Amino acid sequence: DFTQMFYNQNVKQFWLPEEIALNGDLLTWKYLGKNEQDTYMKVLAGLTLLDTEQGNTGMPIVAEHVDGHQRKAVLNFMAMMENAVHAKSYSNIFMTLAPTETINEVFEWVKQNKYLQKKAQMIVGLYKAIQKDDEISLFKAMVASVYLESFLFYSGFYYPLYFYGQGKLMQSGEIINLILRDEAIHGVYVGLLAQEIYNKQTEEKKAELREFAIDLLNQLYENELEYTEDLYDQVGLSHDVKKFIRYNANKALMNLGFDPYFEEEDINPIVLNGLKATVEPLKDDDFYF
């Protein structure tokens, strides 16, 4: 009942980072403190890693196991967006704002950062555990994918949105909003596929799947807290970002058909402001008048 409308929405949202000129951010970037620039680079690098794996691994593997040519076409399109559009856009931003050495250093930093490695290990592990014709392993990977789309990106998205909302780094911010617009529909779509599998189960099995989903969310959440503190303490925003990730965790649960898990909190209003011609043959009667 939904794939065709998601197909149409995904293809109509198609974009490339080159559509957005980035040289306009040069001055507002220059004006940020060293702490702010550091957090910003690292935040986008963490996002780049997530999209790299979502494009290389997550979306293609889910596409492989989901039945139906139209469902596969949507998932293939989403996969392309992840690595050919989203992951690449971050390099466009980096290449504009930062010198090569700072770019090299931040990519080295992703490799050695323990929270980023842990979250990649956990998410990719679940993708690679999918067994052919085994719907339960597929469900588990789809939960992981929804958590990546609708929860994990948001510790990263906070900062570009926070600046956009203050009228700073607005070209980079425009790119990020386009990425976010895509991930929102990706999270909903994968959520609907996960619910399909969940709804086939016995009540006992469903109870176990909810346990899996909640245990996984809590494990990812605890790691994300440490990641958030590590990045945002130097810019004074860790508590604010934490509220934002809890907000989005609830959205991820809802995408999976589950009740919200965290209590509602006031999000920084700045971040909320951050959001040929047709051819006929000639008849013999066309030669007479």
Partner: protein
């Protein structure tokens, strides 16, 4: 944003659900109160102005020296006594941006409208102060408009040629091809649009000195011509414009057409070379009967018969070509070729279509030559003889290359002044003067044909404007009745003026005795059919003007028999691109494309409503795309029956209609006697 531009953009702002057309008038005032008068160079007297313009190499001394200063001052005073005011902002803007004389630094205005008109009139009269005043009254009443070359360059030392339509015949030789390239470059240097006939050129895969599969065809010649036209681009001012015409029975016709396909490679496509296709009646008959046609190798036909393929009548020669084993030919489907033409016209508006038999069944100078091709605007249709350009230190055989003289009557202004006869005769005299004063030293056949044929093109414009301001739909039978009567009177007075000039000078055009004018055949339909209006409204429109009857046409026929005719060709309806703005007129006899046109100049937007557009005549100013193309064809054929040359006839299509509809319009144009089809503009 300047004040006049704001006043012009205020037109679209609707008050009481109506466009503020009158605001445009205010814009003109602003455009003259804020800009034109401030940047117009003023002199203490006209003597100082003329001395400054002559000394600074703006004007020519020769044409001003033919008059005393008192006569020149009287002509200027006659021009300024009209107190002419541009009715729309775009008219004045186009004149003062395109035609008004500016200083070498292009920051000051040396010529007003009256100054330019007076200078052109003095150039036209060639020493006659009364004739100069008549020309000034003609142009300041805006009854007649010299073409953009004549209007812009008359009386100016730093100028191009006054003729910008040139038709060249290319003979089947490397010497002739190189000479054609050279002449095209020289004429583009002069600022003229050059049309070349490539039908005599042998097709691809023909023999050169009895070695087989050697010729590159007409496509290599088109590449050479396209490079020549790109190189010669009016000293880097306008893009070099050229046209190539090929007969549809030439074998290269597909490759020819393939030069305009988007999928064509870089070594196939020509970008600055317009293409036109000449379609004899034989091709239309073959397509109609669905019989497979044959495209012939021109050199084999020339070897077998001693004449070029395009030099003989294909209607009587096609069967002999097909049955001749020594004539090489390729099988084609004529209906597929017609569909390809329609598809190409849908994609790019190319090629121009010339219906050879439609042109030549009414051609008055078939004895000199049959009309084999048209110009860059597909309205010049004249006899041409190919030239034999031999090797060096060897005498060339100079033929006839067409170059007619353009000038347009403003139908609204002419008819409201009840001066069809006077305007036509004065325009004919001015065109004769410009043709006589044209001397091109690098185009031998063009110069020879200008001296011999003395061919001029007298066009008309503001037909749709006149009809809409008089409550007449362009597609109505009343509009066609008016066009019939008006253009029959135009033809009558043009022939009368040509015969009067022949009698005065004692000379006709070369080979006039063989023309249908001399034999009286041309006047047949005029001495038997009465072209008086059949509708009372059109007759009331023509009130106050004598409409020539059959007896008047018989008298004119006798006068032509006794005295001859000075011009081989007199009337051709050119598109009239930018001069229609200055004259506040609709372009040519075409229907208007838009009621209000939006243009972007610099970083500013401007709005030009069609002349006389208001709430009362908004419905009569129907857009061309909304019109039935069959009725537009009917009107153009009605006009064409009184025009010796062709009419620039652009098709106006919607994106919904397919290539079948385009082919149907083309075939109805062929059936109705349309000589040329210019463009297929898709909305």
């Amino acid at each position: 944003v300047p004040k006049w531009i704001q006043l012009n953009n205020e037109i679209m702002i609707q008050k009481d659900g109506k466009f503020q057309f009158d605001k445009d008038k205010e814009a003109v005032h602003s455009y003259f109160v804020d800009y034109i008068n401030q940047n117009t160079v003023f002199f203490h007297n006209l003597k100082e102005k003329l001395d400054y313009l002559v000394e600074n190499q703006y004007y020519e001394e020769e044409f001003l020296s033919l008059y005393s200063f008192e006569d020149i001052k009287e002509v200027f005073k006659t021009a300024y006594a009209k107190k002419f005011r541009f009715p729309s902002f775009m008219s004045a803007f186009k004149f003062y941006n395109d035609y008004a004389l500016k200083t070498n630094d292009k920051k000051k205005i040396l010529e007003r409208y009256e100054d330019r008109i007076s200078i052109v009139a003095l150039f036209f009269a060639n020493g006659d102060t009364e004739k100069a005043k008549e020309y000034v009254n003609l142009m300041i009443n805006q009854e007649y408009q010299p073409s953009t070359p004549t209007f812009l360059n008359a009386g100016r030392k730093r100028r191009g040629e006054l003729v910008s339509c040139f038709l060249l015949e290319v003979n089947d030789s490397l010497n002739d091809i190189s000479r054609a390239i050279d002449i095209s470059m020289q004429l583009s240097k002069l600022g003229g649009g050059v049309s070349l006939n490539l039908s005599k050129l042998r097709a691809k895969g023909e023999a050169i000195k009895d070695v087989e599969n050697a010729t590159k065809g007409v496509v290599g010649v088109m590449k050479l011509l396209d490079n020549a036209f790109r190189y010669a681009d009016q000293m880097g001012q306008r893009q070099g414009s050229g046209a190539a015409y090929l007969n549809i029975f030439h074998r290269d016709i597909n490759d020819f057409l393939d030069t305009k396909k988007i999928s064509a490679d870089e070594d196939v496509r020509v970008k600055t070379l317009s293409i036109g296709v000449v379609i004899p009646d034989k091709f239309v008959e073959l397509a109609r009967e669905d019989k497979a046609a044959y495209v012939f190798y021109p050199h084999t036909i020339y070897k077998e018969y001693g004449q070029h393929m395009d030099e003989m009548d294909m209607n009587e020669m096609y069967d002999k070509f097909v049955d001749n084993p020594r004539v090489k030919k390729e099988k084609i489907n004529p209906r597929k070729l017609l569909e390809k033409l329609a598809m190409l016209r849908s994609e790019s508006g190319y090629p121009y279509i010339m219906f050879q038999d439609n042109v030549n069944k009414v051609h008055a100078n078939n004895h000199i030559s049959k009309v084999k091709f048209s110009n860059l605007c597909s309205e010049v249709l004249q006899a041409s003889q190919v030239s034999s350009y031999t090797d060096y230190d060897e005498e060339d055989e100079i033929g006839l290359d067409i170059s007619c003289n353009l000038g347009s009557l403003n139908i609204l202004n002419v008819m409201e002044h009840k001066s069809i006869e006077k305007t036509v005769k004065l325009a004919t005299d001015s065109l004769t003067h410009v043709s006589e004063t044209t001397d091109i030293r690098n185009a031998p056949a063009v110069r020879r044909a200008n001296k011999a044929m003395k061919s001029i093109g007298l066009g008309a414009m503001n037909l749709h404007g006149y009809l809409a301001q008089n409550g007449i739909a362009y597609e109505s039978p009343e509009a066609r009745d008016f066009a019939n009567t008006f253009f029959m009177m135009v033809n009558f007075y043009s022939i009368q003026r040509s015969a009067e000039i022949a009698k005065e000078k004692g000379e006709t055009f070369d080979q006039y005795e063989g023309s249908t004018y001399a034999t009286g055949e041309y006047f047949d339909k005029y001495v038997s059919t009465d072209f008086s209006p059949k509708y009372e409204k059109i007759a009331n429109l023509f009130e106050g003007m004598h409409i020539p009857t059959t007896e008047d046409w018989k008298k004119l026929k006798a006068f032509v028999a006794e005295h001859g005719m000075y011009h081989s060709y007199r009337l051709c309806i050119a598109p009239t691109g930018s001069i229609s703005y200055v004259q506040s007129s609709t372009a040519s006899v075409m229907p208007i494309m838009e009621r209000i046109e939006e243009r972007t100049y610099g970083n500013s937007k401007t709005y030009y409503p069609m002349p006389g557009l208001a709430s009362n005549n908004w419905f009569f100013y129907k857009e061309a795309y909304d019109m039935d193309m069959f009725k537009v064809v009917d009107m153009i054929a009605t006009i064409q029956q009184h025009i010796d040359q062709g009419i620039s006839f652009t098709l106006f299509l919607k994106d919904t209609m397919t290539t079948r509809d385009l082919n149907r319009i083309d075939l109805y144009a062929h059936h109705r006697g349309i000589k040329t089809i210019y463009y297929a503009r898709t909305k």
